[PDB]
């Protein structure tokens, strides 16, 4: 198959990647506007150049113990259809082209977690980056209740 | 060093914009490669200045004991 | 010249963005503080003056005859009157009057409901009318009139009107408040109440929905005003008044701590500073405020919306009196920022099941202000 | 939705006032000098960016099909061809192309004149065409295409084309310039000349007038470009290019002293700094400038418009080469402010007998800049 | 100062490619401006370092005179 | 300072009453706006007096120290 | 200073040709705009050098007066 | 000197743009040639003025050398 390009980033002292085409902007994390009684995944909203963007907690979703504005300093702004949303992360590394051959199965035993959500591990020089299906994850997790 | 870091992060964003532009982005991508190279080089030059500052301040620390000796002799 | 609807709606969105951009420029200009204040104020005033004239021209372009709405009524009225066993004649006044194309699309659903209410409940059977002593044929009048930068659209029948004693008896039977202390205006407000205007059949909510609450909400989402005037044996007059606007709502802007809330200005009765004497801790564990010798429940804004207050239980805030149908309650806030007309922004996916807030708006440099549903907030209080 | 033309023309007038108000704000902001330059430039750039999108949207709203113009041509062409003893068939390309309603009302008179020129002078008699060895039936092609923010409207015939030798012989007979040194471009420019394109019958000036000067002026008052490409025995192609804009003219802005003049950009050939050697005081008392071994008359701007100069007879200004038909002349000015696109303002009652200025525009805080008529200015020089 | 100047030349080349790429080059122009601003910031910072170095050198010359005066006392 | 705050809230209440009374409220709205201004002036003037009081009782501390100093000198 | 003025005028002429070339003149237009910036900067640099020369000539006049005073001493 | 060198780089870009416009780039080539010629002339003038400054500063050093030599006699 044709090569696939990923934006590579850090969360919980581990390395992850997502689809390049769905990424709009990469910006520094600054204080989020809170709304009461919201599901734990949603931090709140922020304003980017006049536009209100939802901000979501990737750290709680992946069961990571990192602290809000202390240990996470970057927001990656993602667009799916008419929905724009920022994922909170430690930082961004580089853009990486991966062939399908160098994508290894995810180690996780939970069925749709290790297939539909986790695409696999990208192997570069025996270093692994966790490839995440952000489109499936946002469409499923936010609408499950 | 912060400006050099900001330049590298801007270059990373610029590379994605060049990729989106496709055929039209090809020359801009080559320029972005040099921007990455200069961002690294600027940081290296700044580090060479830090090494000279450390050596110079080391001379001030050596000089301070000599100045105290000059005060006594 | 004939154009697509989507293009002229996009022009409205763009001139909305221009007004937002002008506000952003004004906020930056105020922070910057230019030396020649008169030169700046004159320049900004000229820009604002041009912007208002430009908006008026865009709205003037969007004008379309009320005839497009009115022309469809005589066939509908005659067949509907025949279905309900009535004899009715229809008078249409002001067909040549002008209003926005989006208003023409949005007005048909509440106007049709008002027309059905006149042909059903309002206008009696022809024998029954003859027995009363009036003409056997009913009179239904739909009138449209230009009024002060608004259009006023009036539905009047020669019917039996709204029986006030029956409304009061239903209110008394449910124990809503004392019938003697309900005004004619409060009785008119009760007509639009969500629990008092219920449809017989249960079905999923719609803009084409049944009931006076749906009528009130449809008018609110045109930024309009609506009132009901009625006399027993004379008939009912309902007036709908529509500005030149987007989804903009007239509100009262308030804070508790730094948290910003908007109270719809049609649901605000009055506002006041409460004294310690008039604050009554009546039995059940729910505080009461006395206003003019009337006991109203008093609710703290931070507590009911589940947000962090500023640590003050001392009596020094401002209390705003709100009405849900015929029932008044008092809502206590730290500070008032005053009356404002605010563009209404969707809550979208995150807030799917939130009940007390129907919308949001954006203030200053990106601050979020939450638009309260007054009857839902009363429902949260009794939860 | 369908709307009045005057309202959408008023929206154009108002967004023109917005651009002027933005320019006034920019001039005052530049004088004021806010401390945070990047924040100011960002804010002003965002306002400008919104203003361009808003203008583009307003222009997109004003779009109507070219079919409204084109659909009237086949009856007109067939009857007109019949009158002139021709056999001609009409091809229409790009009827579904889109352009402004005011362009539609202003293109018909020059386009009709071009169509008459093809059916009269361009396409020969059917026997004459058969004698030439080409089809007896003429081909007339009207084509419209969308080109880079403009619409390009092209009138092409399979006629006899323009006879260059005959045009040069007439130019030589009048002594306009040497025939050898006339380029094909200069010959094409000569077609639109006011004294070379004259009507047979004398009557009062009109927008519906006869002659290529009227055609060029009608296009100029839409802010458009027009060119003529022609080959002897093949036919003539005339292209009219209309931009998405108001009554705006592309100009070159110049000063002599502090007096501001605008030279139409299409009539500017080139501009240069004269040296003392190339300035020749030839007999008759009229100065000549040599450009590339070619002698051009040189005229001082302050003297010919009757204004006070800066007291400088020393060589140090800039000279602009202007062409009237096939004749070039050189116009000497103190300073160039550069190329500018300027809104065209009416002179009105006061200046009704003024011959060398056709319009004015307003610059900065109320400065007046005068729009030169290049052919009229040549006529003033020879008065 | 040379690296900042070279970075300004990269910004010029990016601007030329942005101009030739038209509508697809609209983002390239913003990057070229921002890179030019980062170069301007680097150059201005370098001039302030040069001024502080020159003042520091003058203090060193004065310190040398003071120890020489002490050496003659 | 309290009366000024009451005047400010009363002006906000008055603005709602003016808005309610529409074309009959137009003159009253101007009166409410000026009453809102007078409340701001009253509060501002009260704060300027607070600043003067804070200086004045600080001058009494200085004067008390000088008088005490005059006693022991 | 005179060379800079010729360059400044040449940029105006270049811009007109670039405008005529339209979409295919856009890269040339960037060069013309940058050259117009440089010509204006060059004139300011020449003025500052002229001002420094004027100060230097004044200092020589003071120096001349001082050496004559040294002759009288 | 940096402006003259930057102008020379701009002349190369103009020369490349003239080449990239081919038979329609002949007028661009004339402008590129004039800018290139102006850059060569400004660079020569920059070398001469810098050399004249070096000679002039050399004269100041010769003059100061005479004054100290007179002082120590």
Author numbering:
A (entry chain C): 14 to 158
B (entry chain M), E (entry chain N), F (entry chain E), G (entry chain K), H (entry chain L): 369 to 441
C (entry chain A), D (entry chain B): 264 to 646
Text lifted from the article:
Upon ligand occupancy changes, chemoreceptors transmit signals across the inner membrane that modulate the autophosphorylation activity of a homodimeric histidine kinase CheA, which is coupled to receptor control by an adaptor protein CheW. Upon formation of the CSU, CheA undergoes pronounced tertiary rearrangement, increasing its basal activity nearly three orders of magnitude. CSUs further cluster into large, hexagonally packed chemosensory arrays, which place each CheA under the influence of as many as 20 receptors, giving rise to highly cooperative signaling responses.
Importantly, Q residues mimic the effects of methylated E residues on CheA activity, so a receptor with all four modification sites as glutamine (4Q) promotes high CheA activity, whereas a 4E receptor produces low kinase activity. We have now reconstituted in vitro monolayer systems using 4Q or 4E variants of the aspartate receptor signaling domain (TarCF), giving rise to TarCF4Q-CheA.P3.P4.P5-CheW and TarCF4E-CheA.P3.P4.P5-CheW monolayer arrays, which should display high and low kinase activity, respectively. For the 4Q system, we achieve an overall sub-nanometer resolution, which although anisotropic, enables the construction of an all-atom model of the E. coli CSU. To enable a detailed investigation of CSU structure and dynamics, we constructed an atomistic model of the E. coli complex, using the 8.4 Å-resolution 4Q density map to explicitly guide the modeling process. As no high-resolution structures exist of the cytoplasmic portion of E. coli Tar, we instead used a crystal structure of the E. coli Tsr TOD (PDB 1QU741), which shares a 96% sequence similarity with Tar. Models of the E. coli CheA.P3.P4 dimer and the CheA.P5-CheW dimer were generated using template-based homology modeling from crystal structures of Thermotoga maritima CheA and CheW (PDBs 4XIV17 and 4JPB42, respectively), which are sufficiently similar (75% sequence similarity for CheA.P3.P4.P5; 55% for CheW) to permit the construction of reliable models (Methods section). Strikingly, the resulting fits collapsed into just two classes of CheA conformation with similar P4 CCC. We term these classes undipped and dipped to denote the relative position of P4 with respect to the rest of the CSU structure.
